Each structure stands twice: as structure tokens, then as C-alpha cells.
């Protein structure tokens, strides 16, 4: 199984909330940003967090996600609505 | 186009070298060759009665490939598995008095000499003889 524990998911969601501008669809750039901003004492945990951040960014680009909400996204939806 | 020992097949080389040593007739053979077995893990005496020449040829070839071997090294080379009744098998070494006499007999032919560090090695005459035998083996293999 490859289910992610709540630690990785919570860290990824908080990182996406705080630093949505700096992230993208590239795993390696994401894993380079994560060590810059966050303190992960493990390399495998940092890789897991970056790999979930990339998946979540792709899902956000496709459409709204049930969880986190970006300030820019909220302001844009205000103009949409 | 010079043949060396490593070029030819080793088993045919041993056979030819043993035949050469037997035909030379200057090798010294112990009196008890017909009443002894070659190790304590063997059950019977060797089938070939002219086994001393074969063992001498094998010893000379080994000293050619890896020089400086003593009696203990030769004893370890020819050791094998020992089955002991209803107990598990174990590694067992050869007889020292056969290896020592083979080395002494080869030294009597001026083919083996004492090594400075310890043990025995080959003389230039022994190396020349082995290379000639290898050339003969290669020629016989190619012609037929």
C-alpha cells in the first residue's frame, strides 16, 4: 500500500496554503522549495511531502479541492461569482 | 608464436608431463608407493600404479602457477571431503610424507629449488621443460 499518513497530508496542505505562489507541477522544484521553507528532519519524509504537494497542485489546477483554499483562489472565485 | 603453460588444456598437460617424467627415468620413487593411500579421507589406494609420476607432474604445474608453496600448502591443495559414518562430512588434508617426498624427488631432477622466503619454487630448467611440454601438447592438439 501507498497511503499517506496524516503527517504528510497535513504538512503538504499547510505548505500549499502558505506558499502557493512558489509551487508548481514539478516534483524536484517542489522538493527544493520544501526544504527551503519547512523543517523536515528526514529526507524520505521531505520526499513524501513534496510528492503529495505535486499531486495536490495538479488536483487544484484541475479544479477546486474539498480541503484547503487559497486566498488568490478565493478572490478569483469572488469575481467568478 | 610461443606456447606457454596457460595456453593449453591443464589435464592433457598433466598427462603429457607425467609421461615425460616416467620416460625420463631419473625420478626417485619411494619403496612404499604400492602399500599406501594418499590421504586419511581416502578409502582405497590409487587405482593407477604409476600415480607418483602424475602427482609429481601436478606438483610441478602448481609450483609453476603459484610459487613458494611448502609441504602444508601442497597438503591443503590435495585435501578433500571426508565422510565419516553417520556423522557429517568435513574437510581433510592429504598426507605430508607424500608431498615432501614428491618435492624432494623434483629437487633431485634440478627442476625445483628452495625459495628464499620459504617453501619451494621452479628453476629456469623446470620452467623450460614445462614450456616445451606445453608446446608439444598444443602441437598435438592442433595437428589432430
Amino acid at each position: 500500500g501507498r497511503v499517506r499518513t496524516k503527517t504528510v497530508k497535513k504538512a503538504a496542505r499547510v505548505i500549499i496554503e502558505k506558499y502557493y505562489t512558489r509551487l508548481g507541477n514539478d516534483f524536484h522544484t517542489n522538493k527544493r522549495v520544501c526544504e527551503e521553507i519547512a523543517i523536515i528532519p528526514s529526507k524520505k519524509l521531505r520526499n513524501k511531502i513534496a510528492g503529495y504537494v505535486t499531486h495536490l497542485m495538479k488536483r487544484i489546477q484541475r479544479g477546486p479541492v474539498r480541503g484547503i483554499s487559497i486566498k488568490l483562489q478565493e478572490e478569483e472565485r469572488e469575481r467568478r461569482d | 608464436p610461443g606456447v606457454t603453460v596457460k595456453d593449453v588444456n591443464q589435464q592433457e598437460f598433466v598427462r603429457a608431463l607425467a609421461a615425460f617424467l616416467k620416460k625420463s627415468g631419473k625420478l626417485k620413487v619411494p619403496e612404499w608407493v604400492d602399500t599406501v593411500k594418499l590421504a586419511k579421507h581416502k578409502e582405497l589406494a590409487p587405482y593407477d600404479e604409476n600415480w607418483f609420476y602424475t602427482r609429481a607432474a601436478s606438483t610441478a604445474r602448481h609450483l609453476y602457477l603459484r610459487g613458494g608453496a611448502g609441504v602444508g600448502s601442497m597438503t591443503k591443495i590435495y585435501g578433500g571431503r571426508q565422510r565419516n559414518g553417520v556423522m557429517p562430512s568435513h574437510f581433510s588434508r592429504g598426507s605430508k610424507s607424500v608431498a615432501r617426498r614428491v618435492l624432494q624427488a623434483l629437487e633431485g631432477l634440478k627442476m625445483v629449488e628452495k625459495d628464499q622466503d620459504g617453501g619451494r619454487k621452479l628453476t629456469p630448467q623446470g620452467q623450460r621443460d614445462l614450456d616445451r611440454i606445453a608446446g608439444q601438447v598444443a602441437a598435438a592438439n592442433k595437428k589432430h
Binding site: - | 596457460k6 595456453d7 588444456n9 591443464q10
Partner: protein, 142 residues
């Protein structure tokens, strides 16, 4: 005549064979002995496979000498094959064009991937309570 040579290694479970390949006429030897004198001769074709697949023409400009150590007989043979193949590929990469290297690599990889990529399998540790890694001692009731 510049001195151009490459040393490349190949591996099996514990066996390692290092092949030195330089400019030459077509000599290929293992521990000083010819390829046809390596034992066991049951697996001789496994040792001649790269030459048969590529032909003597591609080996006709290089001399290759292999030194083997460790493992068993079969592992050493499988290490020698990989060392020969990788040494030839690395020589062609440096001192010939990239197209020839691509051709040789494709031909070798199609036949068998272990000619260029090593096998990671190694022995597993024994665990107490049984003869080996997985097997356990015979249990009894009553």
C-alpha cells in the same frame, strides 16, 4: 599512436571481474588464459555470447584482459560476460562516435539486459529459530 584504454567492471553475487580494454589486434584473455580454457566448459557459450552477437570485426581493434575475483564459478562467468560487454561499450563511447555505441548497446540489450545491467540479488540473513532466512524448526504438540 595515443595510449587509449578503458577499465570497466562487472559484478555477480560476490564475484567481480574487471576488464582492461586498450587498442590492439583482437586479444581477449581472462587471468592470462584464453576464453576457451575457462571452466566450467558447460557454460562456455555464455562467455562467447558478446563476441557471437557482435562479431569478431568489432573486437578486431582492441585487446581485452580480465581479472576475476570472488564468488563461485557460475557467478564469475556471469561477471566476466558483463565486464566484457561494458568495457567494449565504454571504449566505443570514448574513442568512436556515439552512433556505433548506440548500435552495440541496442544489440546487447535486446538479447539480454544482464550483459550491461547488474543483478541486485544477494543472500538474505539467517534468523534465529530456523535453519535459514525463512525456514523454521519443526514444531511439535503433545
Amino acid at each position: 599512436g595515443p595510449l587509449q584504454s578503458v577499465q570497466v567492471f562487472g559484478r555477480k553475487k560476490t564475484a567481480t571481474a574487471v576488464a582492461h580494454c586498450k587498442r590492439g589486434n583482437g586479444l581477449i584473455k581472462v587471468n592470462g588464459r584464453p576464453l576457451e580454457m575457462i571452466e566450467p566448459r558447460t557454460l562456455q557459450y555464455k562467455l562467447l555470447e558478446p563476441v557471437l552477437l557482435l562479431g569478431k570485426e568489432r573486437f578486431a581493434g582492441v585487446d581485452i584482459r580480465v581479472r576475476v575475483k570472488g564468488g563461485g564459478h557460475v557467478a564469475q562467468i556471469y561477471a566476466i560476460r558483463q565486464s566484457i560487454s561494458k568495457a567494449l561499450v565504454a571504449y566505443y563511447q570514448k574513442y568512436v562516435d556515439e552512433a556505433s555505441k548506440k548500435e552495440i548497446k541496442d544489440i546487447l540489450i535486446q538479447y539480454d539486459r544482464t550483459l550491461l545491467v547488474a543483478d541486485p540479488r544477494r543472500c538474505e540473513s539467517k534468523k534465529f529459530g530456523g535453519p535459514g532466512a525463512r525456514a523454521r524448526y519443526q514444531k511439535s504438540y503433545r
